[PDB]
Amino acid sequence: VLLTNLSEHMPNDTRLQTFLELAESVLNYFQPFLGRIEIMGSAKRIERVYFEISESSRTQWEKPQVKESKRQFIFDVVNEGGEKEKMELFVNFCEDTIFEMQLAAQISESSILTVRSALFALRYNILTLMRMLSLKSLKKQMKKVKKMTVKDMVTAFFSSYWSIFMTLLHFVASVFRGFFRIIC
Amino acid sequence: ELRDQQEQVKEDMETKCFICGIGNDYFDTVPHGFETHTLQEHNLANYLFFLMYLINKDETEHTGQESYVWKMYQERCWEFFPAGDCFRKQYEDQLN
Amino acid sequence: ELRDQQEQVKEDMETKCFICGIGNDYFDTVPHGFETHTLQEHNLANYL
Amino acid sequence: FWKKIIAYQQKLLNYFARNFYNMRMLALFVAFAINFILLFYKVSTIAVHYVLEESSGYMEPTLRILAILHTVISFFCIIGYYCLKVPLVIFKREKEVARKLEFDGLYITEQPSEDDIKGQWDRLVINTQSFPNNYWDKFVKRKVMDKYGEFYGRDRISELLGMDKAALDFSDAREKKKPKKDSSLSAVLNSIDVKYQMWKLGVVFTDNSFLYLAWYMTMSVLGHYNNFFFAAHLLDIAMGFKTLRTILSSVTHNGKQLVLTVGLLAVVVYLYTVVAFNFFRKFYNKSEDGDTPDMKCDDMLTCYMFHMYVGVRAGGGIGDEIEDPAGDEYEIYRIIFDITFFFFVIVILLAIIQGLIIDAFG
Amino acid sequence: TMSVLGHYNNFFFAAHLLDIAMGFKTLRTILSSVTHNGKQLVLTVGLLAVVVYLYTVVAFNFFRKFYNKSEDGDTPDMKCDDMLTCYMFHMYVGVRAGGGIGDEIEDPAGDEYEIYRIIFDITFFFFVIVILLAIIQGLIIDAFG
Ligand SMILES: Nc1ncnc2c1ncn2[C@@H]1O[C@H](COP(=O)(O)OP(=O)(O)OP(=O)(O)O)[C@@H](O)[C@H]1O
Ligand SMILES: Nc1ncnc2c1ncn2[C@@H]1O[C@H](COP(=O)(O)OP(=O)(O)OP(=O)(O)O)[C@@H](O)[C@H]1O
Ligand SMILES: [Ca+2]
Ligand SMILES: [Zn+2]
Ligand SMILES: [Zn+2]
Numbered sequence: 001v002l003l004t005n006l007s008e009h010m011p012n013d014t015r016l017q018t019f020l021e022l023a024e025s026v027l028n029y030f031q032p033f034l035g036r037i038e039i040m041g042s043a044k045r046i047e048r049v050y051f052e053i054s055e056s057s058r059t060q061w062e063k064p065q066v067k068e069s070k071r072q073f074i075f076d077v078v079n080e081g082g083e084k085e086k087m088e089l090f091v092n093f094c095e096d097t098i099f100e101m102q103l104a105a106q107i108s109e110s111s112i113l114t115v116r117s118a119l120f121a122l123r124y125n126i127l128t129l130m131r132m133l134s135l136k137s138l139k140k141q142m143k144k145v146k147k148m149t150v151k152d153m154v155t156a157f158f159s160s161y162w163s164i165f166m167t168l169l170h171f172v173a174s175v176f177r178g179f180f181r182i183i184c
Numbered sequence: 185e186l187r188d189q190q191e192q193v194k195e196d197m198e199t200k201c202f203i204c205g206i207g208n209d210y211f212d213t214v215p216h217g218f219e220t221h222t223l224q225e226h227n228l229a230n231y232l233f234f235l236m237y238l239i240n241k242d243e244t245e246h247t248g249q250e251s252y253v254w255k256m257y258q259e260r261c262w263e264f265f266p267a268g269d270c271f272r273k274q275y276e277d278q279l280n
Numbered sequence: 281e282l283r284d285q286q287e288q289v290k291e292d293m294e295t296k297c298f299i300c301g302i303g304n305d306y307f308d309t310v311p312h313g314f315e316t317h318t319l320q321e322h323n324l325a326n327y328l
Numbered sequence: 329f330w331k332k333i334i335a336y337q338q339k340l341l342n343y344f345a346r347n348f349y350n351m352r353m354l355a356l357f358v359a360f361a362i363n364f365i366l367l368f369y370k371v372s373t374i375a376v377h378y379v380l381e382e383s384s385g386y387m388e389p390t391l392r393i394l395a396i397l398h399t400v401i402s403f404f405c406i407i408g409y410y411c412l413k414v415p416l417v418i419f420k421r422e423k424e425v426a427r428k429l430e431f432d433g434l435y436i437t438e439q440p441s442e443d444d445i446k447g448q449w450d451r452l453v454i455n456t457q458s459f460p461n462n463y464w465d466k467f468v469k470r471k472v473m474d475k476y477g478e479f480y481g482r483d484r485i486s487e488l489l490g491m492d493k494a495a496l497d498f499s500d501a502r503e504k505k506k507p508k509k510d511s512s513l514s515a516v517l518n519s520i521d522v523k524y525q526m527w528k529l530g531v532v533f534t535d536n537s538f539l540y541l542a543w544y545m546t547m548s549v550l551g552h553y554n555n556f557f558f559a560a561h562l563l564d565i566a567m568g569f570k571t572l573r574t575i576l577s578s579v580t581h582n583g584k585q586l587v588l589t590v591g592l593l594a595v596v597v598y599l600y601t602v603v604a605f606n607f608f609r610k611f612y613n614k615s616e617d618g619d620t621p622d623m624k625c626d627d628m629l630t631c632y633m634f635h636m637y638v639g640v641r642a643g644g645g646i647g648d649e650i651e652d653p654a655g656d657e658y659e660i661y662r663i664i665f666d667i668t669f670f671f672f673v674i675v676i677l678l679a680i681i682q683g684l685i686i687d688a689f690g
Numbered sequence: 691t692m693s694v695l696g697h698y699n700n701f702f703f704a705a706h707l708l709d710i711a712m713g714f715k716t717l718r719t720i721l722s723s724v725t726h727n728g729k730q731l732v733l734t735v736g737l738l739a740v741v742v743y744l745y746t747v748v749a750f751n752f753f754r755k756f757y758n759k760s761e762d763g764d765t766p767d768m769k770c771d772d773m774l775t776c777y778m779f780h781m782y783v784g785v786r787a788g789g790g791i792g793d794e795i796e797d798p799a800g801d802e803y804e805i806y807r808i809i810f811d812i813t814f815f816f817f818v819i820v821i822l823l824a825i826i827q828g829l830i831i832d833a834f835g
Contacts, residue, residue: 011279035237037230038204038271039264042252046266046274048225049249053233061229070228074202078193083205084311087262094232098239115445122449122530130526136517145333153333157340161407164529168542171533370772381772559747562740571733575825614799622799630799637808641789641815682820689825690832 001034001050003027008048032058060101069097117178125171129163201226204266206273225271297322329511341411348408355401355544356568359561362394366555395551398558402548406541414532415462421531422463425450430468435488436476449530455490456524470496574689581688586681593677597639600646600669601625601632608662611651640678645670719834726833731826738822742784745791745814746770746777753807756796785823790815 003023010016020027033053041047060066073093081089132138144152199208201218203226211217238246238254246254256264272279295304297314299322307313344351370381380388428434435454440447453459460466469489477485486493508515532538544561551558566572579586604612605628612625612634625631639646647666653659696703711717724731749757750773757770757779770776784791792811798804 035230035233036224037227037234038225038266039249039253040266040269041249041264046269046271047249048271049234049253051234051237051250053230053237057233057236061232074197075190075193078196079189084308087265088260090228090231091235091257091262094235097232098236112443115443115448118445119448122533123526126526126529126533129529130522133517133520134522136513138513138517142513148333150336153336154340157337158403158407161410162403164410164532165403165406165542165545167529168533168538169546172539172542367773367777556747556751559744562743566737566740569733571730572737575734575737575822579821614797624799633804633808637792637811641792641811643788678820681816682824685821686824686828690828 004034004036005048005050056105057101060104063101063104065104066097066100069093069100114179114182117182118175121171121174121178125167125174128170129167202228203231204270205268206270211272221270221272226266298324299327344404344408345411348405348412351401351405351408355398355405356561356564358394358398358401359558359564362391362398362551362555362558363562365391365394366558391555395555395558398561399548399552402541402545406538406545409538409541410532413537414535417535418528418531419462421450422453422460425453426460426463426465426468429454430471430475433472433476436472436480436485445534449527449534452523452530453527454488456521456527457490458521458524461524578685578689582684586684589677589681589684593640593673593681594636596672596677597635598632600665600673601628601635603665604635604646605631608650608658608665611653611662613651614649639669640673643674645674723830723834727829731829734822734826734829738785738818738826739781741817741822742780743777745810745818746773746780748810749780749791750776753795753803753810756798756807758796759794784814785818788819790819 003019004027006016007020033055035051035053037049037051039047039049073089077086077089077093141156144156200206201208201211201222208218211221234253235257238250238257241250243254253264256262296302297304297307297318304314307317365380365387368380368382368387369378371377372379372381380391382388429436432438434440434447435451440451442448460468465471469491472489473482473485473491473493482493510516510519544564547557547560566576605625609623609625612623612631613621614624615622624634634649635646638649642648645666646669647662653662656662692702692705711721750770754768754770757768757776758766759769760767769779779794780791783794787793790811791814792807798807801807
């Protein structure tokens with residue numbers, strides 16, 4: 001806290017900067033528990049206040065019922081509340097939430113496969129097209145190249161893309177079948 | 185009216201800070217400035233945790249600022265809440 | 281148009297003072313400032 | 329040897345890439361010709377035959393020629409898209425995965441959400457040797473290696489990225505490599521990278537526009553088996569034009585709210601069906617002949633179908649269809665039933681459902 | 691020219707009542723509201739014609755025995771044996787009907803295609819009557835506003 005206060009109040013001191021790099025890790029560890037607010041001080045100036053936040057406070061602040069109350073309070077305070085009474089409503093909500101998180105401790109103390117199926121369909125169905133090139137069984141195509149002509153050139157060029165489109169159709173059909181099986 | 189009131193509520197939260205009420209642009213002059221202001225400087229959770237901490241802490245161990253805020257809370261005076269001003273604006277000049 | 285004209289009339293009365301025409305925020309910088317201005321400083325009944 | 333066929337192949341590639349849009353105009357004109365010709369069918373005779381009726385006789389062969397032409401043009405439009413826009417999509421995907429791998433370490437420090445098909449499929453490309461095939465930065469692997477090699481293990485990073493550490497420094501120093509000729513079939517089929525091509529095919533298959541063109545081509549192919557399948561190609565103008573595309577998008581702009589409102593309507597009509605089934609059942613005869621009655625609410629499936637079909641569509645409501653209640657002991661109850669049905673279903677809910685889409689358009 | 695033709699047929703003088711619609715300001719505004727968004731209006735009408743045509747295709751292929759429009763059993767007047775007639779029936783008696791094409795075509799109860807025809811009618815009512823026609827009207831009303 002002292003290092004953070006000094007850093008925020010001395011913004012342009014390399015001498016304190018060096019201490020900051022030397023103490024980076026401690027500041028990182030204490031980051032979750034370091035509470036920092038701004039208030040309207042007695043000297044008619046804005047001041048920053050540093051304080052301790054307990055871990056249990058966060059564990060209860062991310063309670064579900066606390067989030068629901070937070071949403072309700074925000075909605076009500078921003079629609080059905082004045083700017084004068086906004087702070088009074090906020091502090092009353094803070095008291096209510098403190099009581100709620102005190103009760104939460106007492107009570108507490110004691111899709112993916114749709115993506116996976118599509119990915120598997122991709123792998124399998126692209127492998128179906130890839131097996132030809134991986135088996136290297138293009139010896140008949142090489143023989144055709146030995147008798148190369150413009151007609152054979154154009155037909156092979158078209159046939160490659162036709163095979164790609166065939167593979168896409170198979171992929172789409174497989175995805176539809178997988179989705180049907182999943183929903184049923 | 186109900187739907188666009190809800191939309192107005194949301195847009196107001198992403199446009200202005202809850203406590204100070206300053207617009208997001210002034211903080212957004214620098215990158216991530218509004219997020220920094222709403223997560224570190226002015227945070228609802230931070231204020232609530234400060235109130236809980238001030239309640240839990242012993243009275244004799246209060247600092248000057250904590251005692252001031254405690255007296256204001258006990259007299260139900262909310263002047264300590266920053267209204268239309270922040271640390272960056274109050275020290276806008278010699279800081280920057 | 282008639283309904284939202286009536287709503288505009290109302291909102292204008294709770295937003296600005298009738299005589300001076302200054303906005304409520306300037307008076308509301310302090311608590312209950314607009315109410316103080318509209319009930320003690322600038323009041324229709326007081327002028328009448 | 330190959331230099332005289334590869335050049336012609338690339339020439340065909342460039343020709344299709346250049347004429348992609350013109351063939352997309354021609355494919356739209358041909359379908360609007362085919363459907364206009366199709367509009368002159370009649371049923372003539374049991375087995376019925378669909379015969380093209382015309383005073384002339386010169387549109388029947390024209391329909392077959394146009395069907396073949398449309399099929400060929402759609403195939404050429406697929407080829408043109410694959411030549412033109414696929415490399416840009418691959419470039420963007422390769423840039424995004426590289427940026428995430430370097431700046432955020434999406435596969436070293438963190439992991440994908442296991443529900444992101446894109447992120448999970450991109451796991452394959454990092455291991456491939458042929459990475460930034462299209463992206464400029466050919467050394468993102470070395471950058472990741474330097475950045476995360478000591479904290480996360482040099483061997484671990486090398487295995488993840490499918491690299492050999494010695495080769496980079498040996499190439500920076502002196503080296504003796506030997507190039508090989510593409511003439512050898514063994515050489516070229518070894519040079520082909522199976523894993524990167526599989527990843528590329530996955531990207532292309534997951535691309536939306538390629539799926540749209542594949543659907544177009546499938547419809548064109550099915551048009552040969554049944555000529556009326558060519559009528560689905562008239563929906564293509566609805567995406568070609570801007571405001572029609574806006575109208576189509578307006579349907580799904582508020583899809584969640586629309587589906588929930590439809591479910592609420594189905595629940596309300598179901599509650600009314602429950603009430604009618606329990607109390608007002610003799611009013612649901614729908615036959616004029618006294619010999620046989622056709623009761624529409626003896627079985628509740630039939631009753632719910634009657635209320636959802638003939639009830640929502642009717643302007644006045646279910647009372648426009650069901651029997652008049654005058655003189656009955658349940659007259660006032662049935663009257664309240666009909667008035668509330670008309671108010672809640674026709675006046676309120678249907679108006680909300682329509683207004684959602686109209687407001688989305690606006 | 692209208693005045694001259696009025697001599698040959700006196701009813702041609704009725705076209706001169708449109709002149710007040712341009713003489714007055716708000717009537718001129720109403721007339722201009724029709725063509726203020728003419729491009730969007732024409733495109734929306736074309737989309738409606740395409741949708742009703744797809745529905746006509748579906749009805750012609752599958753739901754054809756439901757389109758008899760004669761009460762006398764002696765002679766049937768089938769409105770969808772020829773697709774020109776079917777498209778005219780859908781565009782004329784279908785768009786104008788409040789409930790949709792199902793208000794006019796025969797009831798599907800007891801048929802093997804009951805659920806398919808019911809989905810057909812409900813989707814026709816939703817897409818044509820509820821959605822597209824409302825958009826077409828709203829374009830001109832908003833132009834006036
Ligand atoms: N003083 C403030 N404290 C906190 N948030 C503020 C403040 N002023 C404005 N905001 C806005 O409120 C939002 C923070 O909301 P919060 O962190 O509770 O969750 P959220 O935005 O509802 O979503 P999620 O829970 O998924 O993160 C941001 O949009 C932020 O800009
Ligand atoms: N100069 C002004 N004098 C009086 N009221 C003003 C003036 N300027 C604005 N107002 C507003 O007019 C309202 C005062 O109205 P008034 O006291 O006559 O009764 P009201 O608001 O109609 O309700 P009620 O009679 O129940 O108190 C307040 O909303 C006040 O803010
Ligand atoms: Ca002390
Ligand atoms: Zn603030
Ligand atoms: Zn005043």
